Design a protein around this ligand. Sequence first.
Ligand SMILES: [Zn+2]
Ligand SMILES: [Zn+2]
Ligand SMILES: [Zn+2]
Length: 278
Amino acid sequence: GSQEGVELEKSVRRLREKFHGKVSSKKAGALMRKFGSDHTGVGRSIVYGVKQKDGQELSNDLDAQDPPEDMKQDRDIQAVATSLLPLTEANLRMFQRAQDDLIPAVDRQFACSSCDHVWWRRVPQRKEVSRCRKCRKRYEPVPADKMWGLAEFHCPKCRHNFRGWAQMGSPSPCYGCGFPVYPTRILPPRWDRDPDRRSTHTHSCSAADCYNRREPHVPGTSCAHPKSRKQNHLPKVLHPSNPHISSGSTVATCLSQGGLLEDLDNLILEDLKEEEEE
Ligand SMILES: [Zn+2]
Ligand SMILES: [Zn+2]
Ligand SMILES: [Zn+2]
């Protein structure tokens, strides 16, 4: 796959997302060809306009930055800055983040019921949405208190610590003392972390359900691991994402995914391929 395509699309997406999608793709594309994918500097240049064209005390809460004169004088940048007025108390933190080259972000879990597809994605804090890669529909996150995966347990009674595949809000029995322990959190699968965070990792459980049950087992418990789920003919998805209803300002995934298993350049490349066909 040609990287210069992935990187062009990445930088149009990043310019847009720093303006919460209020800059168009056709316009971002032009800006990114003409200025060599420099979303940071285009972005900084737009905010300079807004600060300049705004007459409120609010615009002193924006930094005054040096815009390349070929950007300061560009009429398409300037028209964008106008198109984004006015500057409001509800607008102002968007514009600050844009000039700080900042897209605040969060790792979230996602679950497409009809694909029975679960995945993780680093998404923007302003719009925690990711697209199912099997069926191409956008979904909202699984709620924090319903997430499942490799979980960390800290028994409050005896201080045994253990790791295991599990869902939030569902106690497991402490292997130490038998009292019920709720998971503290879920750890996403990551190539730079312990492989026990992967579903591919060998798993053994005290649940009666378990595809690979530990002994002694606990008689009325059910295992969250997808192999167990499948073996018991249950859907791998324990708790589906609500489908996301598009409001219009969404920007497709342009965030670096860190050590999550699905990296960004491949996500974008598959996106560009899908478009070639259509
Ligand atoms: Zn799907
Ligand atoms: Zn215990
Ligand atoms: Zn199990």
